[model samples]
Target: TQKVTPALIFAITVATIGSFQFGYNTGVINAPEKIIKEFITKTLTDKGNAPPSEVLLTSLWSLSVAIFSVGGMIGSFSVGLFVNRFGRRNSMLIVNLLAVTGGCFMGLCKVAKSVEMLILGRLVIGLFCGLCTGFVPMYIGEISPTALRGAFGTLNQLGIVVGILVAQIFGLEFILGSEELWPLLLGFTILPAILQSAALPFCPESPRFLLINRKEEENAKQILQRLWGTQDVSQDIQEMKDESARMSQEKQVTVLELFRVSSYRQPIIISIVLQLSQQLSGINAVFYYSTGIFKDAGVQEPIYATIGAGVVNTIFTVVSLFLVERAGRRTLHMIGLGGMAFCSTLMTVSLLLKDNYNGMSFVCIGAILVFVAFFEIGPGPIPWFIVAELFSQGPRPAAMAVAGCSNWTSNFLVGLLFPSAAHYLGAYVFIIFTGFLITFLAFTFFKVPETRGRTFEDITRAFEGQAH
Candidate 1:
């Protein structure tokens, strides 16, 4: 049995700080929407002859929120190049600088009196998170023991939810989201970046990267010993050697080649679809607009209600952390998607009837809570790590880059378009998500396999079995 060593615990904890920052930056901008908008208006008024038009101000605000996703898409596209050249751990270490730099930009935006600085800061952080989402999961998946891989993989999502919860809490009116402190809230991403940088140097490089990619067998064995807490890592070494021998003949895959290659076609499609469905399922629409949704639902304290959703988001993610290994990745994801579809339907019905029925508002809030809970169950966590499991060392980086870009691009669309969607669809916005949820559910049912206890080779072969 491979024991979970203290070093393993420390390494995972350190690496997941990147995931936390990803979540933090995503959620941090949400609560301070009004204050930031006011700042933008004020800055524009000071610069120009008169106040900016509402349409101009709204578009600027939308750009500020959506630009992060744009940066993320660019960052994820670059992950293939960064990880292949620098390796996962080093890539993570390097990206921390981006976060700090971005944080500085955001922190000083108010003093600089430039909305451009704020948008630029958000873009830089978005870039950091894009690289972060790819590197952290790849690093964690490569380092984890097969038996514990699912659980550890779930930690990436767990860190993200925790970060979201923290940002939501901090963004409360009495906290940093106040007019005076909103800059501090936006800049808070720097804290975790600094923390990760300090501890990441102490963690060992991924043993698989060393053995398979770097051809340093002796060093890889030492890292395996430290990480596994067993001096006898012969089995682990043999497994990596087997993968390395297989990879010897295969050249590293590029993003375009991932789609063109026949053997990679099925898994690549599954990967892309899983990522796209994750965002298109409208989880971020809920996160980014829950405050407005709650207000519309007649919640007396919409901000508090939004925080309640954040709490449910964090708690259910913890629930998923415990259930993932036992339930299997495919099963949990299907369950979550099915449940979300059901909740979305209920949410739409309640919203549509909110004015007709006195109690429909309560039902709307309940549906939102349950919807977020279902998201954390499977969809929220599985896609992040499963891509790593689907491909081996040679093609994993390229596959992850493609998958990460798909997720971020979908996220960008949702962020940029959800408001107009809400305006046109109103109570029926969730119905759109329900439709997406059902389609994704059907795809997972037929396509995505249970990856709980499978090896990388076994997972790849499972896809190959279907490819023919």
Candidate 2:
């Protein structure tokens, strides 16, 4: 019973810097939109092109945002290889190379006066985000004890949404979102990356990773003692031994085998669906354009409303942190999806009425707030950790790889197409998300299992029962 040692806290804090950058990069563009567009136009004009068309600007801007998702997909898909090769902590350290590079591109894009640089920066940072999303949850899940796993797991998402809130606030003009400082806003990701790199070496490697994967029991025991703060780690070590021995009977679970193997089918399916639902729920789409909706509602300080949404996002996720272990994963996910579905429908109706009705704008704002709140309550946090929980050490890395890729792929599609979708569908845009929410809700009701307070082997057996 470690009960929160300095080593555990330091490791989590450092690992979550990646999580923070994940949220920061996602929200960073929201406040700097005007400045970014102006710079893009200036760069284009300075290069001897006429003023770019709205279509061109929209396309390019969307590409800048969407490309990050594409990069995230690449980073996520590559995690299976990275984790297997470098181990979790070192994989994270290597991932920071991309972060620093991306930050430099963002920082120097103004000086270079290159839109391509900015786009490239978005792509690379997205790559970093992809890896972080996969690696952080996996790392945190492995390091945590069964009693505290859910809470520790939520830390990955907690850091991200908090990063989102921080970015949204600093993106205000008085802070960093101004034309002169937009580069600094985008480049701020490097600060955390540098800090994470500096601190990671001091943290211990995951004892589970050492004992189960590498078969270095002595080293694993030492780290476990440091992590758990107990000289006697026999119970924990024996649990790992049991898990390892059981997994040893089977061949190593490969990415393809996740599909080909009958026993793994349910976990993989649940993993994929959950990850897809997280993205397809249009959470990012709401983030992408929430400010526009607030402006349409006659809020003179639409940015403030977006900031408020970020605040609500952070607050509810913290609530989820407390309730996750008590309420369990499946219950929270169903509630989140169901609530967001209704909120989406309400948002659609409010948007439709914004032009004709008085005071409907505030209704729209309220809908978004509630929508974001519900998102943090369940879908926002659960999918990231649930996949890690569903699989044991053998298949866990591959499962996370696939789930991470699915999340980033859906994210890319939403980013790339939502602008056009919003343009064509107008208020009916969220109607698309409402449909996704309903589908995800149904899937959760039937497929997702409650993993609260269970050991890894118990979870695997439960899945095996479902398979049979």
Candidate 3:
């Protein structure tokens, strides 16, 4: 009878705190870039290391940023092992250990006066992020009701953008962005980890996970009753049992088996492409470089513009939450990728115009905002949930592992290359993303199936038909 029960709300809220930590760490460094660089320089000198060349400083700074993705890639790949071995809730709780340790490293960076420590801290946090992004979405997807799954799934991304916006605010010069406080800003994500860990006990283990994976029928039914807030859980329980029986007939699919199995290969490939497209679209690069883009456009306070972009990022992801159910996943994914392609071209032209004609500066800003908006509307949030939809219990974790790794690797490449590319190519940088968007648009149009309002079984069955 109840739609948005307290259990469901509490579960999503606590899980998405990990997502928030992911977003927070992501945006926290943007405002304090200069301060962190200064700390790096000071620490290098204090260590009696040679005064680093500009090349060395830039490389180290870029490493500090790119290394997060490396850690993320590693974490993404390892999600299968963790989730399979520990179960979803325990896996999430375990990963927070990395977050707490990472926070300690960054919080102590200024006290220790070490750039190496800061880089190590980022790597650890990246690892935590990699794990959370993959795990949280999977957990949310499994726990959610079919009708509300898409809406609940968006919570992960909502937490993420909110974290980014909050971090942006915190990074203001008057706040934690100050030279004296930047280390603290970097480490503040510990609060979320601690809070989530404390509240995690109240949350129920995912019903699907309990029923299908663990064979804990009674436990799963009880949790479903609690979550659905109804005495009648027969329908949900029997559906899960049907899935469990079906999955039991198939030998449990491992990571290698997922690739070797013909039925799973298409979904695996789809998941990878979508993940790759999401990251290679250069959204992180946009976040990393946006303030500078606004500054070049003559905004006196580029941070304000950056914050504004963060606001747009959050707003559209919420729009996406509602629209996801109304519009099919395939349609919205197509809209996001297609619309972003055009916006990317517009951004290119606007940036070029601003280079030659100062009057067109604000146009560049507007184009970028729209570009980011399109990203959040579909591509940004959809990939996180759709991967869960494409595969059933047997191969789902493995498929997620591959998808998550693809995302992190692409993210690493763009973050590593975007700054240098932007410097060399100037306004031409967006043209690269424009090409990526178009490629993904074409891919989505032809290959991505609509999953809205369908059961996971229904979605995967369609993919199974294609697989043969």
Candidate 4:
């Protein structure tokens, strides 16, 4: 499909749903931060007269959101069995039961008025969502064309932004009196899951997924016929078989064997460190705990401000889509990192001096958005994209497993610590993030590669040498 084929566009749109779910989960709370807070407070109070201190309050919220990622980290490592057994499409269909469960529990918490019930629901949602996160893009990358893969792969991040935007738009009602909106916001995820569930059965299974499992060649051919909409499937099918064999051999590489050869040691380190950089930039903190950021900005309705931040984030992400194709990967990585580092430094200064002139709080709010805008262009897209690019297909899932886990681990740290950090570190959190950004820039400058314009076969050099 050369110029705007319907099939390619349709596929891109469908694949993007996974990204939408990812972003929506991250941003949904933004619109409902106040309601979520009330729910947490209610839960904490029922246990005793003990409402958590504000620091504790922030931690609880961070943990809830952060822990979803932690669960994702665990799930990413563990989901290989399912991916191998059921195939990507089937695994997604099965795990999406998480979305349904999350939606129902969140809705039920509202009806029942129970804090413990809400917590339980969130945990369930987190676990289920985590599994899906592990598999979605892997499946997408396997099926889409190499020529279009980078662009198509980007759909997930964009979908996330769209999801965030959707939540922001819904969450931005000016009324502080809408106490019930939280459950409505949290439960709203059902719509996407329902759509994904409907589409799951119709899409072709990942051709690679079937080949590696020793399924019939004819089945893979039949699927490719639909995917390519062409008669010439021999070369593609053979390529699939070759990739499957490579993946199988790599699968035998134990964790110790991975780096023991020294071939894998550096890539593993680079992959893991890249993830750390993504988190340390404090991007997740922006999404998971932006309510506090808004609260600090003198927003009368922190929920709306949270949603507003999501809205801006989403819109800018759409804008960044144009940049990805034009700008090279490492360039965007550095540019965005530098921009965020600068904005974050400004934020630290703004927060430090805000007590002197509370009226300039708007500047503080604006500064945070600049950081968000910076992130959308860099760490946001490349982390996941590079994960797919970094390893052989056999070890691809495993590499992704480690990367995803590291990401979630950092996410958990931010969530669990931010509440306390916000209180004690206050403006210094930005300084900390600025430090992280500069360090990440250092990594990008020294170690990062540009995977742009390269197919999977073309990218082997990145696994070894200094990145483009």
Return the TM-score for each candidate structure.
0.97, 0.96, 0.96, 0.85
Native RMSD of candidate 3 (Å):
1.6
Number of colliding residue pairs in each model: 0, 0, 0, 4
Q: Using TM-score as the measure, which candidate wins?
A: 1
**Where does candidate 4 clash, by residue pair?**
247-394, 448-467, 449-467, 449-468
lDDT of 3 by residue, 395-430 (tens): 888889888888888877787778788889977888
The TM-score of predicted model 1 comes to 0.97
- Candidate 2 local Cα displacement, residue 162, angstroms: 1.4
Output the better candidate (2/4) by TM-score: 2
Q: Give the per-residue lDDT of model 1 (tens digit) for 122-163.
A: 999999999999998999999999988999999999999999
Question: All models: lDDT?
Answer: 0.89, 0.89, 0.86, 0.70
In candidate 1, which residue ranges exceed 4 Å CA deviation? none
Window of ten residues with lowest summed lDDT in model 3: 351-360
Candidate 2 per-residue C-alpha lDDT over 1-468 given as tens digits, one digit per residue, 9 for 90 to 100: 556788888898889999999999988887787689899999999997999999999889878878888888888888898887889999999889999999999999999999999999999999889889999999999998788898889999999998998998889899998989989999999999999999888877888889998998999999988887888888888988888888789897788999988779889999999988899999888987788888988889787788888889999999999999999999899999999999999999998888899888889989999999899899999999999999889999999989999988888778777878988998898999999999989989987888998888889988788677
Residue 368 of model 1 has an lDDT of: 88
Better of 1 and 3 by TM-score: 1
* Per-model RMSD to reference: 1.3, 1.7, 1.6, 3.8
Q: By how many angstroms RMSD does model 2 differ from the true structure?
A: 1.7
Q: Model 4, range 1-468, lDDT digits (tens) per residue? A: 324346546655665676777776766665566667777787667766787788887767656655566656667666666776687778877877878887788777856766656666676666665565667678767776665556666676778778777766666544322576667677777778888888778776777667656556788777666776776777667767666665556546554555565556667777788878778888766666667767877878776666566666766666656676567677877988999999888888877788898656888888877888888777776676666766656666666767777777787787667767778887787788888889889988888667665655446544545432
